[PDB]
Design a protein around this ligand. Structure first.
Ligand SMILES: CCCCCCCCCCCCCCCC(=O)O
Ligand SMILES: CCCCCCCCCCCCCCCC(=O)O
Ligand SMILES: CCCCCCCCCCCCCCCC(=O)O
Ligand SMILES: CCCCCCCCCCCCCCCC(=O)O
Ligand SMILES: *C(=O)CCCCCCCCCCCCCCC
Lengths: 49, 38
């Protein structure tokens, strides 16, 4: 058959799952340390006092 | 990068509790000495 001129140029692309904006949590300033450290600091604080 | 675990700062906790035990020992030794004196 004899095609006509392309009316839509395309190709092979890459599709991935759209990511999320990862809205920071309210209490995210605690993230640098683990929950165990934060809990142990309170225990250490009480003990020292 | 993960949040620091207790295993990263475990040694300073041991030093702190050791210091708290040493201070109690030191304090009670003075108390024990003074009590004997008088
Ligand atoms: C003066 C020593 C301690 C007082 C101030 C330190 C603040 C501690 C607050 C941490 C709350 C307990 C952990 C929250 C749980 C989590 O991080 O997911
Ligand atoms: C300045 C006052 C004294 C402070 C330090 C007191 C000693 C506390 C205990 C130190 C850690 C003991 C455990 C060692 C761990 C290991 O190497 O396996
Ligand atoms: C000086 C009076 C007594 C004080 C006792 C405080 C002891 C603090 C240290 C205990 C360490 C025990 C756990 C060791 C962990 C490890 O070796 O990895
Ligand atoms: C981890 C072990 C703890 C042990 C705690 C026991 C403390 C004994 C000291 C209390 C006061 C004793 C006063 C004795 C006075 C004296 O006869 O000189
Ligand atoms: C006078 O010298 C009498 C008292 C002597 C012994 C005192 C013992 C208590 C002080 C040490 C505390 C240790 C705390 C940690 C326990 C694991």
């Amino acid at each position: 058959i004899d095609f006509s001129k392309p009316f839509m140029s395309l190709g092979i692309s890459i599709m991935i799952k759209k990511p999320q904006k990862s809205k920071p949590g309210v209490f995210s300033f605690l993230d640098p340390l683990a929950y165990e450290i934060w809990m142990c600091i309170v225990f250490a604080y009480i003990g020292v006092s | 990068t993960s949040a620091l675990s207790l295993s990263n700062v475990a040694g300073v906790f041991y030093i702190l509790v050791g210091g708290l035990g040493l201070a109690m020992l030191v304090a009670l030794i003075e108390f024990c000495y003074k009590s004997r004196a008088e």
